[PDB]
């Protein structure tokens, strides 16, 4: 029993984290087999960052301009190239700690674990969702560039995020591991802003099922609603529309609790219209939307 914001164990990723220095700029890299992956922003300096031309900056570099440190050992760079917004530094030593892994891009509404790192050194682990507006509400300080986000599927680490930058609202933006940004953001220090966000409805429903599984039942009611009358209420409160795919996803959880999805939707509608009136659900006074149906099943 109980329900926590739970991250994947980070050991497999900690053994891949290195430090990358070019000039006076340092950040984190990910060392898998004989390649080190890092944000291409490592090749910029203070003045370059407003309007850098990265192809120009990289042509002016050679292998010996990149200092890669794996704990104590310096790694010898024997090739370099750019793929979208990440650099690939080929090194002369395959990482003996390389796990089985994949590079996967995630969808808004999906969750992942973040291993925050500074100077190649893992500092903390936490769980994040990709927001509908392709930002994440992370916790990141200067030096965290190149920290990675991931899921573990059995023995296999699916890397899905590399951290690049902080937006003015204090939310965070980054790329997948082939260097393609999530959302309409670029790796230069300009006046970019996140678009308007929405609440991830299927996730809020999943969390309500977790609450019931854990004995929190006060928000339940006898009513049911139709998928369309619900979706009509969802729009007014800035919630995403619910699809039949989502109802299907929630199937196992509705089976385990005996509460039809449209039954739980009627509870969500009432919570949205009347609030909680001083009560809590799974320790929170807000409707929580950063747990997927998969997260709930795995933990419960």
């Amino acid at each position: 029993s109980g329900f926590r914001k739970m991250a994947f164990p980070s050991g497999k990723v900690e053994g891949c984290m290195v430090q990358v220095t070019c000039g006076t700029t340092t950040l984190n890299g990910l060392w898998l087999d004989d390649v080190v992956y890092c944000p291409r922003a490592v090749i910029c300096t203070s003045e370059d960052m407003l309007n850098p031309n990265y192809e120009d900056l990289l042509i002016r570099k050679s292998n010996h301009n990149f200092l890669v440190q794996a704990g104590n050992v310096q790694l010898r760079v024997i090739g370099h190239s750019m793929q979208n917004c990440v650099l690939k530094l080929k090194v002369d030593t395959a990482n003996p700690k390389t796990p089985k892994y994949k590079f996967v891009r995630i969808q808004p509404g999906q969750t992942f674990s973040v291993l925050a790192c500074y100077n190649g050194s893992p500092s903390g682990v936490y769980q994040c969702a990709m927001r509908p507006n392709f930002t994440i509400k992370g916790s990141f300080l200067n030096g965290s560039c190149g920290s990675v986000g991931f899921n573990i599927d059995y023995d296999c680490v699916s890397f899905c995020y590399m951290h690049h930058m902080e937006l003015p609202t204090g939310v965070h933006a980054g790329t997948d591991l082939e260097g393609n940004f999530y959302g309409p953001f670029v790796d230069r220090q300009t006046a970019q802003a996140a678009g308007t966000d929405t609440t991830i409805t299927v996730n809020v429903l999943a969390w309500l099922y977790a609450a019931v599984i854990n004995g929190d039942r006060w928000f339940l009611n006898r009513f049911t609603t139709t998928l369309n009358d619900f979706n009509l209420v969802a729009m007014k409160y800035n919630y995403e529309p619910l699809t039949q795919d989502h109802v299907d996803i929630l199937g196992p959880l509705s089976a385990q609790t005996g509460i039809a999805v449209l039954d739980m939707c009627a509870s969500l509608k009432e919570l949205l219209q009347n609030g909680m009136n001083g009560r809590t659900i799974l320790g929170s006074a807000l409707l929580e939307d950063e747990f997927t149906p998969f997260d709930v099943v795995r933990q419960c």
Binding site: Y118, N142, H163, L167
Partner: peptide
């Protein structure tokens, strides 16, 4: 307000 590439 400008974006911050959080290198060190």
């Amino acid at each position: 307000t400008f974006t911050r590439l959080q290198s060190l």
